[PDB]
C-alpha cells in the first residue's frame, strides 16, 4: 500500500488537472461568446440614444457650449 | 462626427414642390 | 530514490493546492457567470430608455412632415 | 522533480499574475461604465425626459 | 522508464497555459472596448447634467413665483 499511495495522489494529480481544464475552458467560451457581443449591444444602445439627442446637442452647443 | 443643421426643422421644399407643381399643373 | 513519506507528503501539497484550485476555478465560472447576467440586465435597462428616447425624433420628423 | 513541470509551473504562475492585472482593470471599467448607466443613462437622462414625455402624455390625454 | 502520468500532465499543463494565454488575450480586448465605450459615452454626462439642472431650474422657478400648477 506504501506505493500505491504514489499512484493514487498521480492519478488525483490528473483528474484535478483535466477539472482545471475543463472550468478554465469554459471560463474562455463564456467571456468570448457572451460578454464581449453584450458589450458590443450596449455600445450599440448608447449610440442610438446619442443619435436621438443630437438635436439637443445643437440646441445647447450652438449658443452655450 | 459631422456637425448637425444648425435649422432642426428642414421643411421638405423640394420633393412636395416638384410633385405639387405638376399636380397644379394638371 | 526519494523517500517514500516525502514523495506522498508533496503530493499531498500538491492535492490540496489544486483543490483549492478546482473549487476557485468553479468559483470564477460562477462569478463570470453572474456578471455576464448583470451586464445583460444593464444592457436591457439601456435598452429601454433609448427606447424612451427614440419619441424625439419621431416628434421631429411630425413636425417636418406638417411643415 | 521533472524542469519541464518546474517551467510550467513557473510561467503559469506570471500568466496568473497578469490575467490578476486585467482582471483588476476590468473590475475598474466595469465600474466606471456602470456608474454611467445608473447615474446619468437612467437616472438623469432617461428619469427627466420620462418624466417630460409622460407629464405632456398625462396633460394631452387630459386635452380629451 | 519515466512514469506515463508524468507525461500526460506535462501535456494537459500546456494545455492549460494554452488556454490561460487565450484568456488573457480576450480580457485585453474586453478592457479595450470598455476603455473605447466609456470615452465615447462621456459627452452623455455633459447631456444629463445639464438636463437635471435644468429640470431643477424649472421646479424652483415654479416654486418661487406662486405659479406652479396644481397636481393633475
Excluded at chain 3, 35 to 50: C, F, H, R, T, Y
Excluded at chain 5, 9 to 33: D, P, Y
Aim: with cysteine.
Amino acid at each position: 500500500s506504501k506505493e500505491e499511495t504514489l499512484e493514487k495522489l498521480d492519478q488525483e494529480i490528473t483528474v484535478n488537472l483535466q477539472k482545471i481544464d475543463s472550468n478554465l475552458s469554459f471560463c474562455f467560451h463564456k467571456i468570448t461568446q457572451d460578454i464581449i457581443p453584450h458589450v458590443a449591444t450596449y455600445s450599440e444602445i448608447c449610440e442610438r440614444i446619442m443619435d436621438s439627442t443630437e438635436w439637443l446637442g445643437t440646441m445647447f452647443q450652438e449658443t452655450g457650449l | 462626427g459631422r456637425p448637425g443643421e444648425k435649422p432642426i426643422i428642414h421643411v421638405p421644399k423640394e420633393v412636395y414642390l416638384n410633385k405639387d407643381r405638376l399636380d397644379l399643373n394638371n | 530514490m526519494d523517500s517514500i513519506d516525502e514523495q506522498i507528503a508533496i503530493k499531498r501539497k500538491e492535492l490540496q493546492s489544486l483543490q483549492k484550485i478546482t473549487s476557485l476555478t468553479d468559483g470564477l465560472k460562477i462569478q463570470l457567470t453572474e456578471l455576464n447576467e448583470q451586464i445583460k440586465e444593464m444592457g436591457m435597462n439601456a435598452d429601454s430608455v433609448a427606447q424612451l428616447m427614440n419619441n424625439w425624433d419621431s416628434i421631429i420628423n411630425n413636425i417636418s412632415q406638417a411643415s | 522533480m521533472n524542469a519541464n513541470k518546474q517551467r510550467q509551473y513557473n510561467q503559469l504562475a506570471h500568466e496568473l499574475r497578469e490575467l490578476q492585472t486585467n482582471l483588476q482593470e476590468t473590475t475598474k471599467q466595469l465600474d466606471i461604465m456602470s456608474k454611467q448607466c445608473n447615474e446619468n443613462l437612467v437616472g438623469q437622462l432617461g428619469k427627466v425626459h420620462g418624466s417630460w414625455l409622460i407629464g405632456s402624455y398625462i396633460y394631452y390625454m387630459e386635452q380629451m | 522508464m519515466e512514469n506515463p502520468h508524468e507525461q500526460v500532465q506535462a501535456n494537459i499543463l500546456s494545455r492549460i497555459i494554452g488556454n490561460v494565454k487565450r484568456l488573457n488575450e480576450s480580457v485585453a480586448i474586453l478592457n479595450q472596448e470598455l476603455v473605447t465605450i466609456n470615452n465615447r459615452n462621456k459627452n452623455l454626462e455633459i447631456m444629463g447634467a445639464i438636463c437635471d439642472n435644468y429640470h431643477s431650474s424649472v421646479q424652483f422657478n415654479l416654486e418661487a413665483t406662486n405659479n406652479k400648477k396644481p397636481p393633475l
